[PDB]
């Protein structure tokens, strides 16, 4: 936390998650409980989407949110964009459900059996003890999360190359994509038309390039400690790293909301509905060209608008926490109105 003086600070219940921000074990426990909640939502809602799926209609009109996310990977897709056999969606939903179960079990284990601070441990638990002031352990955690995201990108790459086939909007069948792009100059040139790429080989080439970039960043962050040039320009607290991550996930949400509404192959038009139109009224939303009867919207509209609004409010959360990390009081803005 910030703690502009008053080192022994007490937070009330409406800021109740600020109480464990200094301790270590509850800091692990709350986050793995949150990951259990995300895995539970994923598995339980693709099961709920299998429960409320009709094969006599098109996909995106009935609010199909997760089954197009699995059909773009090409798991149970047939011919012409038709889904007749849904075994592996139920398989990955059950996998995510039991994964949420074991993650919640570990969360309650760290809340109950593991102590608050990991400095009282003796074996490997003392090596996992972290503080918001030393950047070395934070760099180790940073590099290992970099390595895990790179491993996830490599798993997606193997799903595109060896472990299965992806889906395209041209042939509307599965496709075993091999021999991707190997040139980084055209990847440097992809900063202008990244929204419409229209080729899956370029997609898996960009994915293996960003995956190898992530592995390089991971081994770089594990190998060298963080330097001194960034410690003079970046703040080192809980709310500072919270702010950097909040701005990162808000930018990622804006990027994903732009990617959802205009793409055609990473979001097929028969699975998510037609591509959208960026329409600014009061706020910039995404409207469909055709109008659904029961005031309804496609999955593309729901995904793009929800991710845009969540990215917007996460940007203001980054703003709140980043101004908090710079020393602002925030009753100073109430004292500025009260002095007036």
Ligand X SMILES: CC1=C(/C=C/C(C)=C/C=C/C(C)=C/C=C/C=C(C)/C=C/C=C(C)/C=C/C2=C(C)CCCC2(C)C)C(C)(C)CCC1
Interface contacts to ligand CLA, rule CB under 6 A: 11, 13-21, 26, 28-30, 32-34, 102-103, 105-106, 109, 111, 118, 123-125, 128, 142, 146, 213-214, 216-217, 220, 226-227, 229-230, 242, 246, 313-314, 316-317, 320, 324, 331-332, 334-337
Contact indicator for 15, 9 with CB cutoff of 8 Å = no
Q: Which is nearer to its own copies, 171 or 291 (CB)?
A: 291
Q: What is the CA radius of gyration of the chain?
A: 23
CB crowding 78-101: b at 16 or more within 10 Å, else e? eeebebeebeebeebbeebbebbe
CB of 340 to ligand X, least distance (A): 33
CB of 79 to ligand CLA, least distance (A): 37
- From the number of C-beta atoms within 10 Å of its C-beta (0-12, 13-18, 19+), residue 217 rates as middle
Contact indicator for 195, 206 with CB cutoff of 8 Å = no
- Round to whole Å and give the CA distance between 174 and 331: 58
Interface mask (CB under 8 A) for its own copies, residues 276-295, using x and -?
-xxxxx--x-----------
Interface mask (CB under 8 A) for its own copies, residues 12-31, using x and -?
xx--x---------------
The pair phi, psi for residue 166, each rounded to 5°, is: -85, -170
CB of 3 to its own copies, least distance (A): 18
Alpha-carbon distance values, 74 to 264, 270, 271 (Å): 15, 13, 11
CB of 333 to ligand CLA, least distance (A): 7
Residues 319-338 that bind its own copies (CB under 8 A): 319, 322-323, 326-328, 335-337
- 71: CB partners within 8 A, 6+ apart: 59, 77, 83, 167, 268, 271
Alpha-carbon distance values, 252 to 190, 224, 312, 339 (Å): 17, 27, 11, 40
Q: Which is nearer to its own copies, 37 or 47 (CB)?
A: 47
Contact indicator for 70, 89 with CB cutoff of 8 Å = yes
Q: Which is nearer to ligand X, 154 or 197 (CB)?
A: 197
Q: Measured at CB, which residue is nearest to ligand X?
A: 206
Q: Count, in order, helices (H) and strands (E) of the chain.
A: 9, 4
- Round to whole Å and give the CA distance between 146 and 106: 22
Residues 50-79 that bind its own copies (CB under 8 A): 50-52
Q: Which is nearer to ligand CLA, 223 or 290 (CB)?
A: 223
CB of 328 to its own copies, least distance (A): 6
Asked if 188 is part of the footprint of its own copies (rule: CB under 8 A), the reply reads no
279 contact, one of ligand CLA, ligand X, its own copies, none, CB 5-8 Å limit per kind: its own copies
CB of 86 to its own copies, least distance (A): 9
* Bridge partners, residue 286, by sequence: 278
Q: Which is nearer to ligand X, 55 or 189 (CB)?
A: 189
Using CB under 8 A, list all residues that contact its own copies. Answer: 10, 12-13, 16, 44, 47-48, 50-52, 90, 108, 112-113, 277-281, 284, 319, 322-323, 326-328, 335-337, 339
């Amino acid at each position: 936390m910030q703690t502009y003086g008053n080192d022994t600070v007490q937070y009330e219940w409406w800021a109740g998650n600020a109480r464990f921000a200094d301790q270590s074990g509850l800091f692990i426990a709350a986050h793995v409980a949150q990951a259990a909640l995300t895995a539970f939502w994923a598995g339980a809602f693709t099961l709920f989407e299998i429960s409320r799926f009709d094969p006599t209609q098109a996909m995106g009109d009935q609010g199909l949110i997760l089954l197009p996310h699995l059909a773009t990977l090409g798991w149970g897709v047939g011919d012409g964009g038709q889904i007749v056999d849904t075994y592996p969606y139920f398989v990955i939903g059950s996998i995510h459900l039991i994964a949420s179960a074991v993650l919640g079990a570990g969360a309650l284990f760290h809340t109950l059996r593991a102590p608050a601070d990991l400095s009282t441990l003796k074996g490997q638990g003392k090596k996992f003890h972290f503080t918001w002031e030393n950047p070395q352990q934070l760099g180790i955690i940073l590099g290992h999360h970099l390595l895990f995201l790179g491993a996830g990108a490599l798993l997606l790459a193997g799903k595109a190359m060896y472990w299965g086939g992806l889906y395209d909007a041209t042939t509307q069948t599965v496709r075993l994509v091999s021999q991707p792009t190997l040139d980084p100059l055209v990847i440097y040139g992809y900063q202008t038309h990244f929204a419409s790429i229209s080729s899956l080989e370029d997609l898996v080439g960009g994915h293996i390039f960003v995956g190898f970039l992530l592995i390089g960043g991971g081994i770089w962050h594990i190998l060298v400690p963080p330097l001194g040039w960034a410690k003079k320009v970046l703040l080192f607290s809980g709310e500072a790293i919270l702010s950097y991550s909040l701005g990162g996930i808000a930018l990622a949400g804006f990027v994903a909301a732009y990617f959802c509404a205009v793409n055609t192959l990473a979001y097929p038009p028969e699975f998510y509905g037609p591509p959208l139109a960026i329409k600014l009224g009061i706020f910039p939303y995404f409207a469909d060209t055709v109008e659904l009867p029961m005031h309804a919207h496609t999955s593309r509209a729901w995904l793009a608008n929800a991710h845009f609004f969540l990215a917007f409010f996460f940007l203001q959360g980054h703003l709140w926490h980043a101004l908090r990390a710079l020393g602002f009081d925030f009753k100073r803005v109430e004292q500025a109105f009260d002095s007036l």
